[PDB]
Design a protein around this ligand. Structure first.
Ligand SMILES: COc1cc2c(cc1OC)[C@@H]1CC(=O)[C@@H](CC(C)C)CN1CC2
Length: 377
């Protein structure tokens, strides 16, 4: 009733449905907008990520205090509510409210799920493979969001995508209730490491910063696009590379040494974003997006297991707070990317900002090298 494969499949389907509900509202954004960079789409991107950043550490403490399954089930009882709220959203305020709920549900699911994955798969290699599979599920969600949403919303109606996603969610929630059975509390054995200590560390800082700055590029590029069939096939070149990269490096990273794969993933992000401006909409902006996605997938699949590795090598073997920190770093892009990046743009323009990002990415790339051999304690 607790085989590792089942929990891995849980986290897979969790991140898949979460990101599908995330990106399925894209064909529904203009239908609430019209009724450079955008401000309203910026707020739609912001609110959820900001609430996720607000709620990640508190979830990382809740899991250590009552267990993982109850957080995961709270996530899957929230997402089912946010989906219905979406399905019954007319104005802008209700849209933002539903997005923030969805954000709390996401934060919950992602943090507690990565924590359970690191807690079950105790060994390394297998944990690398497992994190790769989970991020591949996330990628599959990002891929299957836009086209599914577009086709349904354009075929039968605008409520149907949200309601079908609600049904899929409910099925996922039932599966999870069968596999995990959170009907009883279960606190972890050891007292978790104080978050202040985990944050004072250099190495977790370096890994989290690498994730954050490898995500910031594609986080600032998207909410400022020529859009808002160019809407459904908008985010295909990014996700079709994210998946192919993560579900290949998750299994072939430890053999090379993550430190090398992380450095290469940051370099590739940099060289892709730097070349973004040399493009047009249909012909140009595709291939650089593919490079960006492949590289950020490499970086994510290389840096997600390291977090648990660092904690096992230098702290008490608990996985909640550290993966909450990793998720905070990953999602900080979409909170300070649209608004602050939008202001930087409207001051200087996007053909300049992307270069700046590329510079900071190429500078932060060799800083991963200090993830070669962290001295234990
Ligand atoms: C509708 O809201 C949003 C829309 C989308 C996203 C973010 C938003 O909100 C958080 C994700 C975030 C990711 O994970 C990116 C993965 C890349 C690297 C392949 C891709 N974009 C796609 C669009």
């Amino acid at each position: 009733r607790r085989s590792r494969k089942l929990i891995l499949f849980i986290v897979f389907l969790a991140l898949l449905l979460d990101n599908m509900l995330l990106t399925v509202v894209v064909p529904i954004i203009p239908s609430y907008l019209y009724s450079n960079e955008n401000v309203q789409v910026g707020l739609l991107f912001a609110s959820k990520a900001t609430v996720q950043l607000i709620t990640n550490p508190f979830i990382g403490l809740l899991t250590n205090r009552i267990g993982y399954p109850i957080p995961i089930f709270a996530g899957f009882c929230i997402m089912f509510v946010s989906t219905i709220m979406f399905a019954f959203s007319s104005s802008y305020a209700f849209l933002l409210i539903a997005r923030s709920l969805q954000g709390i549900g996401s934060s919950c699911s992602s943090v507690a799920g990565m924590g359970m994955l690191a807690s079950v798969y105790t060994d390394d290699e297998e944990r690398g493979n497992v994190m790769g599979i989970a991020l591949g599920g996330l990628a599959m969600g990002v891929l299957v969001g836009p086209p599914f949403g577009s086709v349904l919303y354009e075929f039968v109606g605008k409520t149907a995508p949200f309601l079908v996603l609600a049904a899929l969610v409910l099925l996922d929630g039932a599966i999870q209730l069968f596999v995990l059975q959170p009907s009883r509390v279960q606190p972890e054995s050891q007292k978790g490491t104080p978050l202040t200590t985990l944050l004072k560390d250099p190495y977790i800082l370096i890994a989290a910063g690498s994730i954050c700055f490898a995500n910031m590029g594609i986080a600032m590029l998207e909410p400022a696009l020529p859009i808002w069939w160019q809407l459904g096939v908008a985010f295909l070149p990014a996700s079709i590379s994210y998946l192919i990269g993560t579900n290949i490096f998750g299994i072939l990273a430890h053999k090379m040494g993550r430190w090398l794969c992380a450095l290469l993933g940051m370099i590739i992000v940099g060289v892709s974003i730097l070349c973004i401006p040399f493009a047009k909409n249909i012909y140009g902006l595709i291939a650089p997006n593919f490079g960006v996605g492949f590289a950020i997938g490499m970086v994510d699949s290389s840096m997600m297991p390291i977090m648990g590795y660092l904690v096992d090598l230098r702290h008490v073997s608990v996985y909640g707070s550290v993966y909450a920190i990793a998720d905070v770093a990953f999602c900080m892009g979409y909170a300070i990317g649209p608004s602050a990046g939008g202001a930087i743009a409207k001051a200087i323009g996007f053909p300049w900002l992307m270069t700046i990002i590329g510079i900071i990415d190429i500078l932060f790339a060799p800083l991963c090298f200090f993830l070669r051999s962290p001295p234990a304690k």
